[PDB]
Amino acid sequence: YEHSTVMPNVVGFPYKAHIERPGYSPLTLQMQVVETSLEPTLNLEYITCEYKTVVPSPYVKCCGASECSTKEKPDYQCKVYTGVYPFMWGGAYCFCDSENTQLSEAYVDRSDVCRHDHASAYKAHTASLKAKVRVMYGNVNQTVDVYVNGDHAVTIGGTQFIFGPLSSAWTPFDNKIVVYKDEVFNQDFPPYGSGQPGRFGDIQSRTVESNDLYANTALKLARPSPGMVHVPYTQTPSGFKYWLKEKGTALNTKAPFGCQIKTNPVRAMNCAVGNIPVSMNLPDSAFTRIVEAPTIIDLTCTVATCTHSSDFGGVLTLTYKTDKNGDCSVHSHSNVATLQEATAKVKTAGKVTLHFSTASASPSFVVSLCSARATCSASCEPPKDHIVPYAASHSNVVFPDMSGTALSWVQKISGGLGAFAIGAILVLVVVTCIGLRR
Amino acid sequence: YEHSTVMPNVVGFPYKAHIERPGYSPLTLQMQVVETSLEPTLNLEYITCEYKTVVPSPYVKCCGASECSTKEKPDYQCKVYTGVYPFMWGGAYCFCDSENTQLSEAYVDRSDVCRHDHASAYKAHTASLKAKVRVMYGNVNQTVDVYVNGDHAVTIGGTQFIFGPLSSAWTPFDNKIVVYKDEVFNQDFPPYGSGQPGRFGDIQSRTVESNDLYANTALKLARPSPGMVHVPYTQTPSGFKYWLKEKGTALNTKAPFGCQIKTNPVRAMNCAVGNIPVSMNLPDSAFTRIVEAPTIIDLTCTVATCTHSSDFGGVLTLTYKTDKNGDCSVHSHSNVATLQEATAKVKTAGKVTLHFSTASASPSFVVSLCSARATCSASCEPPKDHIVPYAASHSNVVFPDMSGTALSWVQKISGGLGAFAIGAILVLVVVTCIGLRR
Numbered sequence: 001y002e003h004s005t006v007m008p009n010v011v012g013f014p015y016k017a018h019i020e021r022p023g024y025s026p027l028t029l030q031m032q033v034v035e036t037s038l039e040p041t042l043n044l045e046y047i048t049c050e051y052k053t054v055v056p057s058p059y060v061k062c063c064g065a066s067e068c069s070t071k072e073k074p075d076y077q078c079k080v081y082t083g084v085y086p087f088m089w090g091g092a093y094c095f096c097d098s099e100n101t102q103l104s105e106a107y108v109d110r111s112d113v114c115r116h117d118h119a120s121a122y123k124a125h126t127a128s129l130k131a132k133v134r135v136m137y138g139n140v141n142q143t144v145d146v147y148v149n150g151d152h153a154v155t156i157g158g159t160q161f162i163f164g165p166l167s168s169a170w171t172p173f174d175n176k177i178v179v180y181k182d183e184v185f186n187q188d189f190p191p192y193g194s195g196q197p198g199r200f201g202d203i204q205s206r207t208v209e210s211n212d213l214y215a216n217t218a219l220k221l222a223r224p225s226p227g228m229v230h231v232p233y234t235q236t237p238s239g240f241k242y243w244l245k246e247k248g249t250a251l252n253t254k255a256p257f258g259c260q261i262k263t264n265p266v267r268a269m270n271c272a273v274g275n276i277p278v279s280m281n282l283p284d285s286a287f288t289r290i291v292e293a294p295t296i297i298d299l300t301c302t303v304a305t306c307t308h309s310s311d312f313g314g315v316l317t318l319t320y321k322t323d324k325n326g327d328c329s330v331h332s333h334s335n336v337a338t339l340q341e342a343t344a345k346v347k348t349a350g351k352v353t354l355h356f357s358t359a360s361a362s363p364s365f366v367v368s369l370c371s372a373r374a375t376c377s378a379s380c381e382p383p384k385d386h387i388v389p390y391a392a393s394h395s396n397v398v399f400p401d402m403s404g405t406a407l408s409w410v411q412k413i414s415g416g417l418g419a420f421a422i423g424a425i426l427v428l429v430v431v432t433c434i435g436l437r438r
Numbered sequence: 439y440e441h442s443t444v445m446p447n448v449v450g451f452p453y454k455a456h457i458e459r460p461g462y463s464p465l466t467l468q469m470q471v472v473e474t475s476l477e478p479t480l481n482l483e484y485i486t487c488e489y490k491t492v493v494p495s496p497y498v499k500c501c502g503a504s505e506c507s508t509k510e511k512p513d514y515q516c517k518v519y520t521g522v523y524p525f526m527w528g529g530a531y532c533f534c535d536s537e538n539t540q541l542s543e544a545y546v547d548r549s550d551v552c553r554h555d556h557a558s559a560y561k562a563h564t565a566s567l568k569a570k571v572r573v574m575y576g577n578v579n580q581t582v583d584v585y586v587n588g589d590h591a592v593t594i595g596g597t598q599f600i601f602g603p604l605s606s607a608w609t610p611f612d613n614k615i616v617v618y619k620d621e622v623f624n625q626d627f628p629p630y631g632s633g634q635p636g637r638f639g640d641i642q643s644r645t646v647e648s649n650d651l652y653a654n655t656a657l658k659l660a661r662p663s664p665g666m667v668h669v670p671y672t673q674t675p676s677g678f679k680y681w682l683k684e685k686g687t688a689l690n691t692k693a694p695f696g697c698q699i700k701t702n703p704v705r706a707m708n709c710a711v712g713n714i715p716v717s718m719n720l721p722d723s724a725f726t727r728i729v730e731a732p733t734i735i736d737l738t739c740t741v742a743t744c745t746h747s748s749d750f751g752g753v754l755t756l757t758y759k760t761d762k763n764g765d766c767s768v769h770s771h772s773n774v775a776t777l778q779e780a781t782a783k784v785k786t787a788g789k790v791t792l793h794f795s796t797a798s799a800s801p802s803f804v805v806s807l808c809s810a811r812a813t814c815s816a817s818c819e820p821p822k823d824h825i826v827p828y829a830a831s832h833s834n835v836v837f838p839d840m841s842g843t844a845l846s847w848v849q850k851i852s853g854g855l856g857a858f859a860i861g862a863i864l865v866l867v868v869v870t871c872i873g874l875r876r
């Protein structure tokens with residue numbers, strides 16, 4: 001028996017579906033979303049880590065000269081000075097007083113611990129939703145892992161379940177992403193090969209193990225002081241170490257809809273948005289023939305107490321007359337009130353109790369026990385607690401019924417005004433007819 | 439010196455850009471797309487391969503009964519038969535005449551070579567382009583590998599190049615893709631866990647190493663014949679073997695725009711569509727001071743022969759008076775004609791020759807030698823060869839100049855008719871003015 005439904009994408013909300021086969025007693029399912037996971041698709045752009053400047057020892061040439069040699073090193077620098085007269089602890093070598101040269105050399109390189117501490121720059125698009133649902137009906141429990149898209153069928157006790165694509169297409173990750181350890185940032189990073197010194201991305205590597213490196217950190221050599229051997233240099237500080245202390249905010253403490261961001265793999269979890277269509281296919285063994293089900297007649301519904309609070313703040317009583325004692329399925333056909341239980345024990349005593357949760361001043365809904373029906377109306381008083389540590393258990397519907405107190409007053413006033421207008425129109429029509437018949 | 443341009447995405451087309459700095463002599467670059475690659479993004483769905491049926495030896499219970507036991511195996515079928523009386527070569531065992539029992543057991547499993555011969559079912563989206571552009575100018579000649587999007591800057595001899603995103607967003611891969619060896623198929627495969635027996639996807643595995651397996655081949659057991667031990671069964675043949683014989687076509691021999699499809703990784707190469715914006719940043723050492731370059735005056739452009747064919751079938755001549763000899767940078771400012779060379783040696787003899795390729799009956803373009811200018815117009819005759827094995831070297835513009843023979847005839851006829859109409863209008867105006875003056 002094929003069936004379909006639409007259920008909210010809220011974690012912990014006890015959705016109940018009612019299936020009415022005409023040759024069998026009604027059946028009630030319960031589906032709950034234990035966990036979700038919004039998995040995006042990532043493409044690595046480059047990898048940034050702190051750099052490490054390498055300064056080889058100077059080559060002081062005594063009584064001669066040396067020439068600069070170019071090399072293919074990241075941000076390589078080389079210069080030759082003239083007129084150096086160095087000194088050491090024992091004395092001063094380079095016997096020639098003035099005709100000596102010193103060759104300074106330096107270049108940048110990736111750090112030693114870059115494999116353990118680096119920031120990745122990604123591109124995020126086309127998120128894929130994956131969920132873990134709990135399905136319980138009849139006497140079968142289970143929890144399953146289902147991809148939320150129209151092409152994954154999972155069977156739970158002979159029933160084939162297909163969870164349709166999510167209603168919305170909203171993702172909390174922008175096009176460009178920077179990932180560091182366990183934090184995700186919505187950042188716009190410079191393109192590869194065009195990084196600026198002192199800021200994020202001064203040195204960039206295509207991959208952790210990639211040999212190629214692009215470095216732009218304004219390394220500049222200076223002339224050594226007289227009578228010294230030190231190879232002076234200057235360089236703008238690391239851009240990664242600066243970005244560490246001035247990155248600002250995150251996405252963990254910034255994401256909308258109250259969903260946590262994690263890493264490895266990057267994903268946003270338990271993130272309440274949209275609706276999830278569901279398609280089923282049940283075998284004949286799930287239902288019970290109508291002859292076995294108890295026969296219920298003369299169903300009347302009364303409400304003892306009501307309080308439109310987050311938890312189940314209502315009590316329901318049903319009176320009936322039965323021939324045998326068995327099991328019925330209880331369902332509410334409107335989303336203004338949600339029943340706590342899905343089955344009840346019908347007995348010859350003719351009285352059962354139910355719990356429901358509502359969020360309107362005056363609810364009106366029809367409840368069914370096995371095959372019977374009954375219309376319930378009640379007056380609910382507001383609660384007293386200001387704040388509670390648990391989520392809402394109702395569908396958040398506030399508009400009262402047309403038979404409520406406020407709507408009754410509105411109806412009475414509008415009826416009086418309409419009666420006055422009708423009398424006015426009748427008098428005017430009578431006068432016009434009398435005038436025209438003259 | 440920042441510059442920007444737009445160059446076609448055609449392999450082998452010799453695009454030349456003209457950079458005219460106000461303080462320096464003009465420059466002509468040459469860019470060429472040697473190779474192109476279009477890489478989609480794939481998400482593996484499952485793996486399919488030929489199955490193998492495992493039939494354990496029957497358990498014949500002499501003088502007794504046996505009971506079937508359920509197991510968690512892919513497509514497990516077990517049945518118990520009564521009244522069997524097996525036989526062997528020497529004699530029949532199970533002494534009891536009819537109180538025997540045989541237990542038939544069978545189940546299906548992944549084949550032995552499924553790790554070597556299998557087809558992957560992907561989902562392809564958000565293709566990314568990548569090219570290999572050869573850039574040559576002055577004394578620079580190099581080939582670079584570039585990502586064709588606004589986020590990769592590559593330095594060629596001191597100049598920064600940023601190749602913008604492709605103009606169009608056309609990709610030849612549908613949403614769903616099936617890959618086999620070196621062939622890509624545009625196919626719609628059944629969802630995981632809902633495969634049908636006999637067709638593609640009868641057995642599905644989430645990954646080649648994944649332990650779980652979904653199998654649905656309609657394996658059914660039958661009662662053994664009297665006096666034999668054989669465990670009969672019937673099964674729908676493999677779906678992979680049907681698919682290999684009824685897959686139909688491919689994408690290698692079906693893709694538009696004449697672009698080859700290759701596998702490992704999945705990619706479409708040399709696929710001519712759209713335009714590639716190019717951004718540049720040149721240093722001041724590439725140009726030459728206008729004082730050093732020769733001065734050109736009294737430039738006349740005369741066309742010797744023209745034939746609007748695919749190759750460079752036009753010969754051009756330039757006459758000039760120059761003070762000193764050096765190098766110039768020729769260029770054509772209209773895409774009607776495409777020159778072959780981007781540099782000519784000027785001499786005191788005042789005569790240089792150039793080749794161009796055009797595809798219109800009567801072209802009209804303005805050519806510039808260093809800083810001079812000249813307008814060229816010529817009459818071209820069609821070529822006789824019907825088919826040639828090389829691509830067109832022109833921009834394929836056919837509309838002739840307003841000075842061409844056909845448009846000259848049109849202009850003359852329209853002018854005659856307009857003169858007639860103007861004369862008639864004047865006659866009518868004079869007549870009506872005289873009439874109104876009375």
Ligand SMILES: *[C@@H]1O[C@H](CO)[C@@H](O[C@@H]2O[C@H](CO)[C@@H](O[C@@H]3O[C@H](CO)[C@@H](O)[C@H](O)[C@@H]3O)[C@H](O)[C@H]2NC(C)=O)[C@H](O)[C@H]1NC(C)=O
Pocket residue numbers: 063064095096
């Ligand atoms: C031992 O110490 C003496 C100290 O003078 C060194 O003699 C010096 O040798 C250099 C290299 O041959 C000379 O430089 C040359 O200078 C001329 C100009 O006169 C120039 O044309 C050459 O190209 C070269 O640069 C230097 O003049 C000379 N000293 C003097 C005072 O003339 C000698 O090289 C040392 N030997 C060793 C093994 O250390």
Ligand SMILES: *[C@@H]1O[C@H](CO)[C@@H](O[C@@H]2O[C@H](CO)[C@@H](O[C@@H]3O[C@H](CO)[C@@H](O)[C@H](O)[C@@H]3O)[C@H](O)[C@H]2NC(C)=O)[C@H](O)[C@H]1NC(C)=O
Pocket residue numbers: 136141142
């Ligand atoms: C379907 O399976 C789930 C999970 O096994 C069942 O939920 C489990 O319900 C039992 C009680 O019926 C829970 O045990 C008790 O939980 C309370 C929670 O405060 C704890 O204080 C007690 O010490 C005791 O452990 C159990 O925790 C709970 N499991 C989970 C994961 O929530 C569910 O009841 C099953 N369906 C049916 C119809 O039984």
Ligand SMILES: *[C@@H]1O[C@H](CO)[C@@H](O[C@@H]2O[C@H](CO)[C@@H](O[C@@H]3O[C@H](CO)[C@@H](O)[C@H](O)[C@@H]3O)[C@H](O)[C@H]2NC(C)=O)[C@H](O)[C@H]1NC(C)=O
Pocket residue numbers: 500501502503533534537
């Ligand atoms: C040697 O051969 C004799 C053949 O007579 C075997 O005796 C057979 O033993 C089995 C033991 O299970 C008897 O089966 C039983 O049959 C009764 C009545 O049908 C049934 O109610 C029980 O549930 C059980 O199935 C079988 O009747 C009996 N054959 C007879 C009495 O003719 C003996 O087991 C053999 N010894 C071996 C194989 O070691």
Ligand SMILES: *[C@@H]1O[C@H](CO)[C@@H](O[C@@H]2O[C@H](CO)[C@@H](O[C@@H]3O[C@H](CO)[C@@H](O)[C@H](O)[C@@H]3O)[C@H](O)[C@H]2NC(C)=O)[C@H](O)[C@H]1NC(C)=O
Pocket residue numbers: 574579580
């Ligand atoms: C700019 O540099 C490229 C390479 O960096 C030059 O490409 C060269 O192109 C010519 C022909 O287009 C190649 O010569 C060919 O060699 C093969 C070898 O079998 C021969 O069969 C052909 O008939 C032809 O002679 C040459 O190898 C190639 N240079 C390479 C690959 O290094 C290009 O010519 C340069 N630009 C200019 C204006 O010279």
